[PDB]
Amino acid sequence: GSTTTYSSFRKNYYSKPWSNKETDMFFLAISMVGTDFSMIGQLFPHRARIEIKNKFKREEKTNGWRIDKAFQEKRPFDFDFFAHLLQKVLAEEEKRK
């Protein structure tokens, strides 16, 4: 302990960077779920709802056109299929890498 207790803003913690296939899956969920960030957070257990909102905010800066294109590329919704796709594609990414 010392009197020189430096203080600075730490709320900007290190979060795991978003993966490219994870972003593709986010767009797929936009197409097949919608913008229900809570249910997306359930679909992405790695990502909490606030991360989903942050992803929406960052993507809409330039990729809002892709948000719309995905949202119109509607698909039947299945939680189990989405989970299998997520894990399988991530494992295939690891194997390719």
């Binding site: 010392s2 009197t3 020189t4 207790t5 430096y6 203080s7 600075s8």
Partner: protein, 180 residues
């Protein structure tokens, strides 16, 4: 309350020293401070730049020999404090302090002033390698302020031929500030 009181009597103090005791958090006490001040509408001075250096520089252990700081590390407080005053006067007019946390500026200025008072024994040191010997902790923005000031002095040096002739850079300029 004690913060505002000390400010009225311009008694030096900083947030961290107080908040180490109260189990406080930046958001909590900063928001409470804003609420109280805007509720009561009280006037209060700001932290004067030179106000805090006087007590801060006196906190260093560089002024007497110790196993952590042999004589080649020991230095006289007067010379370094004069150098740091001559550096902070440069800092503000160069817009460096406005909108920033000042203590990084003070840390960088003190580190470089101490280095340049005996650079041959001190150019081999480093920010952390320094601060740990005097039992001091340093900001990460201290490096940012160091880069800023190094750019400023390299900009300064080219104006004089008898400094320009040495083709100064980051490595060499530290020992020449005594001339600049």
């Amino acid at each position: 309350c004690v913060l505002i009181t000390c400010r009225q009597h311009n008694w030096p103090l900083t947030m961290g020293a107080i908040c180490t005791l109260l189990y406080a958090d930046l958001d909590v006490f900063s928001s409470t401070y804003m609420q109280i001040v805007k509720l009561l509408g009280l006037d209060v001075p700001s932290l004067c730049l030179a106000e805090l250096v006087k007590t801060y520089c006196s906190s260093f252990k560089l002024f007497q020999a110790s196993p952590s700081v042999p004589a080649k590390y020991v230095e006289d407080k007067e010379k370094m404090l004069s150098r740091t005053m001559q550096l902070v006067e440069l800092a503000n007019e160069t817009w460096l302090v406005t909108g920033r946390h000042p203590l990084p500026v003070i840390t960088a200025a003190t580190f470089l002033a101490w280095q340049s008072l005996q650079p041959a024994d001190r150019l081999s040191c480093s920010l952390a390698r320094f601060c740990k010997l005097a039992n001091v902790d340093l900001p990460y923005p201290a490096s940012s302020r160091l880069q800023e000031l190094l750019a400023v002095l390299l900009r300064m040096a080219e104006q004089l031929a008898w400094l320009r002739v040495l083709r100064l850079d980051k490595r060499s300029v530290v020992k020449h500030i005594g001339d600049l």
